[model samples]
Target: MQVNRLPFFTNHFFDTYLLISEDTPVGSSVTQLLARDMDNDPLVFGVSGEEASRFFAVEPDTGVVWLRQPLDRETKSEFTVEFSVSDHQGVITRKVNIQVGDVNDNAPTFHNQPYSVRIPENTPVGTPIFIVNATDPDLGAGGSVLYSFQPPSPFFAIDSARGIVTVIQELDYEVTQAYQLTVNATDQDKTRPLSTLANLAIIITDLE
Candidate 1:
């Protein structure tokens, strides 16, 4: 007579890391959990851990791990999924660390938009007026932001790498009391870059 024995996971079935893109569609298979048992028992696979259960699903008969919800690296970059394989005799569990890869899902956005600044008309032509600030939530090149003028200003210039706005031409309160410029913020995505626009209001005050 054959004796029933405990189920055991394969040697390779240990704590491992899986890298998946955050833009991965729901219901997509992230990875397959593999295991083997000597007793030839019919095994079932399951996942435990509130966060793991919330974002992922596992096939009971098979070991395919599936994405149940959308992933956002900005919200949570990395997490661990606890997977269990069980036969009627015994159950074995392994931890799988999931790393969410970044995608160009976010665009650059200007903070404190519609900026207003007052500078004396006698301000130096090459003096910096203000700094335009923008941010992107994506990682790597996607998160890199560059500044520029939307209409290509003739009187004002912006440092593309630093977002510093400077007065390129001499300012005169009599000639122009106020100037409105549109600033563009663009993310550095290779194929499909994202961008946004903001307004900068400059008032040239008469020097005493």
Candidate 2:
């Protein structure tokens, strides 16, 4: 009787499992008779082994197999499955590990949601207005961010990568007492726009 060996599992930022069986005959039906957690307690049968293979087996019983559901990141639970031959003549078991990886799901967040800065009247066009600092939970490319000005402000420009907000036009105290603008910070890896963070009503006051 050959004891089945688990396959090496790999995934990124998401919980997944790879099922492998030892040197079993191809197309041999291997049914998971039972499976349980580390505690040796009986877990929900259908939920765990729903995708268990029976009719088709990997060559030398070694290949990537799918799981019914993704693993739980916070739980980090370990589990084992017991298998039996279709004819009920032989039985072997394998331990499958569910590993969870990190994902770039976090949105860029501003240090100050709505920052305010004061500039004297007649401030130079290149004057620094307010500094926009953004942070994303994920690092590297997953967390790389780009900044932009919403509503296309003619009075200001921002360093897309530096979060530096600069006055592109001179400040006028009489004509425009205060200016409110929107600044957006977006993560490069995210597909949804909601994953981008924005600072609205970034108020700039003209010094008297």
Candidate 3:
């Protein structure tokens, strides 16, 4: 209810509840209902700790308190939420703190998207063109990182740790005839990046 910091890390905690009902004019009942934490000292929630039951409800005669379940944005952590209330003689706990927010379904794929090769414009400046793969399914380091080639062509050079894509200059099919590229695959963890583009078209004739 104003979480800034303090053991604030969630994986499940009813996502900060919000349910109020105080119309005590129908049966002269309902004095202050918002219950949870049975009280046994397991962090003041009783049995199996971590808020047990994960949120529950069943009040026919008024006797059942179990609520706590809201935190799964992939794998949350850090926790603190203790509640207590005593107006009509029931419910009084306190320990609020929550923080869980991180989601970015990665989707940057391109092992070959219009990527064809046949460099031979007198090919001989370290000639070795054919390696521009990409993939980021969000596994580690937010899904590994590094890779670039957009307006960055001294003729061609991108090894970003082994993605290859080499050939640094020396291929001019009569003054540049094919070389339309724009491949970018990144994931440094800033949280939003996934690109793909490749088209090293080359087709000259004079080796008959």
Highest-TM-score candidate: 1
Candidate 3 structure quality by residue, lDDT tens digits, 1-208:
7422222112233455422222112223212223433331122122123442243222322323333344333453333544443333343444444343333456557764577776667766766667766676654565776777777888887777466777777666677767766767776566565555555554533443
**Superposing all C-alpha atoms, what RMSD in Å does each candidate have to the true structure?**
1.8, 10.8, 14.3
Model 1: per-residue Cα lDDT over 10-78, one tens digit each: 635354678889999999998787777786789998899998999999999988889999999999999
Worst 10 residues of 2 by lDDT: 5-14
- TM-score of model 1 (CA atoms): 0.94
**What are the Cα lDDT values of the candidates?**
0.87, 0.51, 0.49
TM-score of each: 0.94, 0.51, 0.32
Q: What residue pairs are clashing in model 1?
A: none
Supply the global lDDT for candidate 2: 0.51
Best by lDDT: 1
After superposing candidate 1 on the true structure, give the runs of residues whose Cα lies further than 4 Å from its correct spot.
Answer: 1-4, 11-15
Output the better candidate (2/3) by TM-score.
2
lDDT of 2 by residue, 113-199 (tens): 457676677667887666777787664565787888886798889989887887787666777776767777888874543245465
Clashes of 2: 2
